[PDB]
Scaffold this motif. Structure first.
Motif, PDB file in Angstrom:
ATOM      1  N   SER A 121      -1.450  -6.560   3.354  1.00 14.43           N
ATOM      2  CA  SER A 121      -0.543  -5.897   2.417  1.00 14.43           C
ATOM      3  C   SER A 121       0.339  -4.840   3.066  1.00 14.43           C
ATOM      4  CB  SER A 121      -1.379  -5.307   1.290  1.00 14.43           C
ATOM      5  OG  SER A 121      -2.152  -6.350   0.688  1.00 14.43           O
ATOM      6  N   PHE A 160      -2.642  -7.936  -2.366  1.00 16.90           N
ATOM      7  CA  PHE A 160      -2.423  -6.928  -3.386  1.00 16.90           C
ATOM      8  C   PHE A 160      -2.263  -5.550  -2.751  1.00 16.90           C
ATOM      9  CE2 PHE A 160      -2.642  -9.489  -7.069  1.00 16.90           C
ATOM     10  CZ  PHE A 160      -3.399 -10.579  -6.701  1.00 16.90           C
ATOM     11  N   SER A 161      -1.425  -4.709  -3.355  1.00 25.02           N
ATOM     12  CA  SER A 161      -1.015  -3.454  -2.717  1.00 25.02           C
ATOM     13  C   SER A 161      -2.177  -2.494  -2.495  1.00 25.02           C
ATOM     14  CB  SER A 161       0.071  -2.769  -3.548  1.00 25.02           C
ATOM     15  OG  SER A 161       1.275  -3.532  -3.540  1.00 25.02           O
ATOM     16  N   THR A 162      -3.303  -2.752  -3.153  1.00 20.88           N
ATOM     17  CA  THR A 162      -4.468  -1.919  -2.988  1.00 20.88           C
ATOM     18  C   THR A 162      -4.991  -1.944  -1.555  1.00 20.88           C
ATOM     19  OG1 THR A 162      -5.694  -3.787  -3.854  1.00 20.88           O
ATOM     20  CG2 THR A 162      -5.198  -1.984  -5.358  1.00 20.88           C
ATOM     21  N   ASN A 184      -2.962  -1.823   1.052  1.00 25.61           N
ATOM     22  CA  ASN A 184      -1.939  -1.293   1.945  1.00 25.61           C
ATOM     23  C   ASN A 184      -2.509  -0.081   2.674  1.00 25.61           C
ATOM     24  OD1 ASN A 184       0.371   0.999   2.137  1.00 25.61           O
ATOM     25  ND2 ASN A 184       1.140  -1.020   2.752  1.00 25.61           N
ATOM     26  N   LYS A 234       3.680  -0.056  -1.713  1.00 28.44           N
ATOM     27  CA  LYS A 234       3.646  -1.364  -2.352  1.00 28.44           C
ATOM     28  C   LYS A 234       4.173  -2.470  -1.449  1.00 28.44           C
ATOM     29  N   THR A 235       3.668  -3.676  -1.639  1.00 23.04           N
ATOM     30  CA  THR A 235       4.194  -4.828  -0.910  1.00 23.04           C
ATOM     31  C   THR A 235       5.595  -5.167  -1.377  1.00 23.04           C
ATOM     32  OG1 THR A 235       3.462  -6.508  -2.467  1.00 23.04           O
ATOM     33  CG2 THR A 235       1.884  -5.783  -0.758  1.00 23.04           C
ATOM     34  N   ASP A 276       5.291  -6.934  -4.772  1.00 25.97           N
ATOM     35  CA  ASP A 276       5.035  -5.928  -5.784  1.00 25.97           C
ATOM     36  C   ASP A 276       6.338  -5.214  -6.171  1.00 25.97           C
ATOM     37  OD1 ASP A 276       3.598  -4.249  -7.470  1.00 25.97           O
ATOM     38  OD2 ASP A 276       2.030  -3.899  -5.959  1.00 25.97           O
ATOM     39  N   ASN A 277       7.119  -4.822  -5.169  1.00 24.92           N
ATOM     40  CA  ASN A 277       8.375  -4.113  -5.417  1.00 24.92           C
ATOM     41  C   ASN A 277       9.384  -5.000  -6.142  1.00 24.92           C
ATOM     42  OD1 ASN A 277       8.003  -1.433  -4.456  1.00 24.92           O
ATOM     43  ND2 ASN A 277       8.193  -2.141  -2.316  1.00 24.92           N
ATOM     44  N   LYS A 322       8.751  -7.699  -8.096  1.00 25.24           N
ATOM     45  CA  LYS A 322       8.160  -8.431  -9.222  1.00 25.24           C
ATOM     46  C   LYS A 322       8.926  -8.311 -10.531  1.00 25.24           C
ATOM     47  N   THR A 324      -9.065  -9.968  -8.019  1.00 29.71           N
ATOM     48  CA  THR A 324      -8.341  -9.054  -7.143  1.00 29.71           C
ATOM     49  C   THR A 324      -9.252  -7.931  -6.662  1.00 29.71           C
ATOM     50  OG1 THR A 324      -7.625  -7.639  -8.934  1.00 29.71           O
ATOM     51  CG2 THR A 324      -6.217  -9.541  -8.409  1.00 29.71           C
ATOM     52  N   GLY A 335       1.576 -13.667  -9.913  1.00 28.90           N
ATOM     53  CA  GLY A 335       1.339 -12.239  -9.980  1.00 28.90           C
ATOM     54  C   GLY A 335       1.579 -11.680 -11.369  1.00 28.90           C
TER      55      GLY A 335
END
Length: 330
Positions: free
Chosen positions: A39, A130-132, A134, A142-143, A146-147, A149, A190, A319
């Motif tokens: 991520s 998932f950004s968690t 990162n 954020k990925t 994610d950004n 989406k 997730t 997602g």
């Protein structure tokens, strides 16, 4: 909005795939390894220890009018293969296949481990887990997905990897011409930050299907298919002369063999990996011992549906608020 980019194997074995990514203003195009198992979006850069750069294209933030140092932020990551990198963080404009994110964290490498240095074809990674997961500290980032989406037509991206051939990553839409039959969707957890799902079983060659739950991750950044030792033993027992070699680091087989296919279950559906996909060639130049594309996950701590499996399918990473995975034949 949508995006569509071609992804290309880095070598004759499909060891990994690179996808062109535009970073900064004016655009700087870097070829990144799209990785659904991590991520961080990180790049070789003008800040990378000079001795650790060997042929890669670098990102130079000082040449980008839209680059801004993310003050105080650092990153450091280690991957399942033991490789690693670390550095600091800029935000900049990032576009993939026509799809643009402004203010994307671009993680600039100060240090990379030898395996990255040694691979001149990979300019960095673009994580799609998932950004968690990162690693940016003290403010997690954020990925790219994610950004993007909220702006996508549909909150999805798809992976269509080729066997010894180019493929496609699409963002925001499902190309109904890119697969055959229907897409079978399956539940995702997730909780570990991955696209984690449960396969419903497997078959070896023309053998009968074994119904059995196999928990694993869909990981475009891993080359091979890693499964429980029981499953892997059952597969290689169908290849005359195949054996697990501790010296080599896994199952090898006679290069004169014809490999059987391997089928994995997605709910009531079946994805067939042709035997040729499981051949990764001589263990060393000129050797008649060949390395297998299905290996034991024992000691990894998780099963990995890597490229060997994913390139046999059209794969939807959904997602939506409740994420799911879809697989179709192609």
């Amino acid at each position: 909005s949508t995006g569509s980019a071609t992804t290309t194997p880095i070598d004759s074995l499909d060891d990994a795939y690179i996808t062109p990514v535009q970073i900064g203003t004016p655009a700087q195009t870097l070829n990144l390894d799209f990785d659904t198992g991590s991520s961080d979006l990180w790049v070789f850069s003008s800040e990378t220890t000079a001795s650790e750069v060997d042929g890669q294209t670098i990102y130079t933030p000082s040449k980008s009018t839209t680059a801004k140092l993310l003050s105080g932020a650092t990153w450091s990551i280690s991957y399942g293969d033991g490789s690693s990198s670390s550095g600091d963080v800029y935000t900049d404009t990032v576009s993939v296949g026509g799809l643009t994110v402004t203010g994307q964290a671009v993680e600039s490498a100060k240090k990379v481990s030898s395996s990255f240095t040694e691979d001149s074809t990979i300019d960095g990674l673009l994580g799609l887990a998932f950004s968690t997961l990162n690693t940016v500290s003290p403010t997690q980032q954020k990925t790219f997905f994610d950004n993007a989406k909220a702006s996508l037509d549909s909150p999805v991206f798809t992976a269509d990897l080729g066997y010894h051939a180019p493929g496609t990553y699409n963002f925001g839409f499902i190309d109904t011409t890119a697969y055959t039959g229907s897409i079978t969707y399956t539940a995702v957890s997730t909780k570990q930050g991955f696209w984690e799902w449960t396969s419903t079983g497997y078959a070896v060659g023309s053998g009968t299907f074994k119904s059995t739950s196999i928990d694993g991750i869909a990981d475009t950044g891993t080359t091979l298919l890693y499964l429980p030792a029981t499953v892997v033993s059952a597969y290689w027992a169908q290849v005359s002369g195949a054996k697990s070699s501790s010296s080599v680091g896994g199952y090898v087989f006679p290069c004169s063999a014809t490999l059987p296919s391997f089928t994995f279950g997605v709910g009531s559906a079946r994805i067939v990996i042709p035997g040729d996909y499981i051949d990764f060639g001589p263990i060393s130049t000129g050797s008649s011992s060949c390395f297998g594309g299905i290996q034991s996950s024992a000691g990894i701590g998780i099963n990995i549906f890597g490229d060997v499996a994913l390139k046999a399918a059209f794969v939807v990473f959904n997602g939506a608020t409740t994420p799911t995975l879809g697989f179709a034949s192609k």
